[model samples]
Target: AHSKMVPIPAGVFTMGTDDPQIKQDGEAPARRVTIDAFYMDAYEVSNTEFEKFVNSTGYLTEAEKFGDSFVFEGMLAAAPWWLPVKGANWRHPEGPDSTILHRPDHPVLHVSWNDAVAYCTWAGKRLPTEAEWEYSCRGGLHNRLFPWGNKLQPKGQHYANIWQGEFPVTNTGEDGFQGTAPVDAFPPNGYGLYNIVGNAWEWTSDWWTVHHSVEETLNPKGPPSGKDRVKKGGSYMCHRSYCYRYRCAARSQNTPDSSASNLGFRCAADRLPTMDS
Candidate 1:
C-alpha cells in the first residue's frame, strides 16, 4: 500500500497565468490544460526517503557518476563565477564539505531527470506527467497566480518559497529561507500538497517544448525527442527580475543529464483499475 497519497480530482482549468504583474516570459499566452484524477506525494521526496532508495539499491545518481554538478553562485557566500564543482553529489550538495545534517527533511537536490526517474522506478511509481503535475500544482484553482491565488503576498503572507528582495546579491529571507526549506515548511494547496510552486523546480515526465497548440486534449504529453526534459513548480532560486516561473502553468527545461541544487522531483502513479472486469 502507498504510504502517502494526495488525491487530485479530475478537472480542467486555465493552466498558465497572464497576470500583468507576472514576468512576461515566465507567464505568457495562457492555455487550458486538462488532467485526470490521481495521487501524488504530499511533498518533494526528502533526503530520508532518498537515502532509503540509495541504500536499498546502491543507486549512484547522475551527478555522482558525472563527477560534477552546478551550484548556484548566490548560494555561495562569495561569488566566484560559480564553476561546476567536481565530486558534488546528493550526499555532498555543496561539495564534500557539506552534509545533510539537519536538512534530512529537505528535498534532495543535485538530481537529474534520469536520476529522478530511477528513484521513481525504484519506488514503483513514475514522475507525474506535465498535465498531472500542473493540475496537482493548481490544486483545483483556476487562473490563480499561484497555487493559492492571484496575490503574490496575499494578506501580507508568503505562500511558497521564492526569492525575496534583491536576488543573487541580497536575500531578505522574508520567506524564512535563503535556500531550500523542509519539504512541508509551507502551507499546503487546496489538494493538500506542499512545495508545489517553489522551493525546488520538479522534473516532469514530458519532454521539453514551446507553447502547446490550441487543441482540447486529455493527459497531454510533451514532444517526442528533445535535448531537455520539462521542469515545473519553479524553485527557491526563482526571482521576479530573472526566473519568475513559479506559476502552475510556467515550464522550463534542462538537459536530461544536468543536475543542479535547485532541481528536485516528485513521483506519481496511475490509479489502479477497479475490479469490474
Candidate 2:
C-alpha cells in the first residue's frame, strides 16, 4: 500500500560484470561504483504491503517463529524442489490452508532476512544496497541484460514472472504467473521500477560476498561481516533451465533466518527531509 518512491539520481555505474552469465556469482571485474542518492520501492513489497506491517507490529515471522517454511515444492499443498512447510509463513503462504486473502497484489512470500529487516524498520524504510540493488536495477542501463535490454523477451513480450514451462515440473503459466505475480505485474524499468527483475527475490542490505571490490566503490556497504544476506531479483521459481538468476548483474544468498516460497522484500531510502514552517 505504499509504492511510490523512485528517486535514485546518483552518479557512476558499471558494477559486477566483466562478462558473467553466472560465473559462480562472483560476477567479475566490472567495477566503478558510486551511487549516492536514494529512495526505492516502486513495487515488490506487497501482500497488502506486508499487511500494513503485520497489523502494526504484532510481527512474529521467522516462519511464524520457526514452526516451518520453505514451500516451493510446486508451491505445495501438496517436491524435491523444496518442502519444509509446516504452515509456511507470510500469512500462511501455502500450508496451513493458504491465504494472502486473495493475493493482495502478491509479492510477500515467507519473507526473511529477518522478515526483510522487520518490514524495512516498520516502513520508515531501509534494506537495499548491493549497490542500491544494481543501481536501481539499471534503469539508466549500461551493460544491459535486462532492466529492459539484451532481450529475455523484448518483442515477444513476457517481461518477468519467470519459469515459463517444465522447470520443477511444468509451469507454463506463460508469464501471467503460476506463483506470485502482480506487484504491478510487468512493464516498468528505466526507473518506473516495478518487478525489478522478476516476481520476487529482493532483500539486500548486502552481506555475503563471493568476490567484489575490483577497486572503485563508494556506497558498497556489503562485506564487513557475513552469514549470507544478498538476495536480488530472481524468483517465481526462476528458470532458464534452472535459476538463471533473472539478471541485472545477478546474485543470490540467504540465511538471516531463511524463510521461502521464493523470498521477498523491497524498500530503501536515504533522502527525505523537508517540510516545516
Candidate 3:
C-alpha cells in the first residue's frame, strides 16, 4: 500500500513561474525555496495500493459515498449534470460499472486530501509539503519547465503525460495515454520520481495560499487553515490554451472534501526529528 523509498537530495530551487507571457493565477512572484532531505514515492499511489487501504480500513472514499465524481464532458459521449456525482469513489472511478481491470498501475483518482491523509497515516508517512514536492521535482536542476528540463518535447521526445494534438476535443495520445498513464510509463526524473509534473495532480499537506510571502523558508508549510488544500503537478487534461499547470512549480487548490478524477497524491516521510523531544 506504499511506494518504495526514493531519496530527495535537499537543495534550493526557484519555485513558481514569473513569465509575463504566462498569466497563471496561482503561480506568481517566483521565488527560491529550500527543503530538507526526505524520501518520496517514485510514482503516484496506484489502484492496488488504494484497494489495500480500503480493505484494511473499511473506509469509503468521499466520491464513493457521494455516488459519483466529475468527468470531463469530452471524455464522456453525453454530458450529465456537470456537477459532482455520487457513488464515484476510488474503486468505482467512472461509476459502479467501471473497474480497474486494465488500470492497475494508473494513479488512483477521486481521492480527496483527507482521504489521502488517511492513507498516508495508515502507511506510516505524511503528505509531502509543497516545498519538498517542488524540490524533489526539480531533479537537481533549476527553473526548468518540467522535472526533466525546459523542453516540453526534447528532440521529438515526450517527457510526461500531457495533452497532445489539441485540447479536450482532441487528444492524440502521442505520449501514449489519453487520460492517466502508468506510474512508470515514462522515464523518471533526475531525482528518480516518476510523473512528477504531469499525470494527475498530487495533493500536498499545505493549505491554500495565494503567494509565497516568505522569501527564504526552510520547509515552508502553507497557510495554517483554509477551506481548500494545495495540490501539485498537473494532469493529462491540462492544455496550453486552458490549463497548463503541468509545470512542477504550478499549483492549484480545491476543497478538502472534494474529489476529482484528475486529483491524486503521493506520500512523504520526514527525515529528521524536531527539537521538541
Candidate 4:
C-alpha cells in the first residue's frame, strides 16, 4: 500500500541543533546541509498500510520470527518499564491479547529497522536519510524545537502526542492518548507532513553517529559503517524530564533487529513509485 506522499523540495537546510537537551544524543554543531528533493509519506506508516504489504509479500517481521518484542510497561501493569513480551509483533503490539484491528489508522509499532526496509522495498520506496528526515521534519523552519514551533504546547494546545505527565511512572494522556495516536492526530508541518515529532520513533536509513560533520555537506547519508541505525522523532514515551528528543534535530539509535512498541517508520522516494495514479 503506497502512502500519500508530500513532495519535499530540494533546499539547503541546517541539520542538527545548537542547543540539545540530551548531550549524548549527538544533536549539536548544527551543520548546514543541502538535501535532494524527495517524496515522503504524509503520515507515519499505518497498521492498514503494513497489513497490505504483509498480505501481498507474506512477510514476517523480525519480532514475529523472534516470538517476542519489547512492550512499554506503562501499557501493561506499570511493571518492568520495558519488557520483552511474547507474541508482541506488529499485529499484536501490546502483547498476545492486544491487536491492531481497532487501530488501523495508528502507526504500526514493533517494527525493526530491517522490517521497515523490507516494507519500503516492497512498496518501491526507501527510508529517509538522517539529513532528509531532519529536512522534512524542519519543514522549511529552522532552529525550532518542533515542526510547528519551539513551544511544546502553543497557547495551551498540544501539537504532538508526547508524554504529558511523569515519565514512565504516569501518563496523564493529556495529549488525548496514553500510547500511539493516529498518524495524523496532530497538525502537519510547513511541508505538509504529519506526526513528524511524536507518536512513534520513526526509523531512518542513516547509521548511528555520535558526532556530525561540522563542514557543510550535500546529501549526507551517515557514517560509512555502524552497528545501529538512527531513529528520529521521539515516541509517545518521551517526556521533558527524560528522552526530550521530540524535536526536529534530536536522534537516537538501536540495532537493526531491535523492535519495540514505540518503533515505526515512514517512507521516502526518489521519484513517484507505482501506487496511486
- State the lDDT of candidate 2 residue by residue for 56-135, as single tens digits: 88788888888988887766622366888787788888889988888888888888887888788777778888888888
The 10-residue segment of model 2 with minimum total lDDT is 268-277
Assess the local accuracy of residue 275 in candidate 3 as a C-alpha lDDT between 0 and 100: 26
Between candidates 2 and 4, the one scoring higher on TM-score is 4
lDDT of 3 by residue, 199-230 (tens): 98999998888755537677788888888888
Ranking by lDDT: 4, 2, 1, 3
C-alpha local distance difference test of each model: 0.81, 0.82, 0.79, 0.90
Residues 45-143, model 4: lDDT tens digits = 999999999999999999999999999877862335789999999999989999888899999999999999999988899999989998999989888
Looking at model 3, residue 74 earns an lDDT score of: 59
Best candidate per lDDT, number?
4
Residue-level lDDT of model 1, residues 1-277, one tens digit each, is: 2126677888886755555344433445566776777778788988888898999999999999989988886654123535588877788888878888779988899999999999988777789988789889888777776889878888988899999987778888989998899888889899999999999889999887665565667778877887879899899888879777888878888889989888899888776333222
- What would you estimate as the lDDT of candidate 4? 0.90
Best by TM-score: 4
- TM-score for each prediction? 0.91, 0.33, 0.91, 0.96
lDDT accuracy of residue 72 in candidate 1: 82
RMSD for all candidates, in order, please. Answer: 3.8, 16.5, 4.0, 2.0
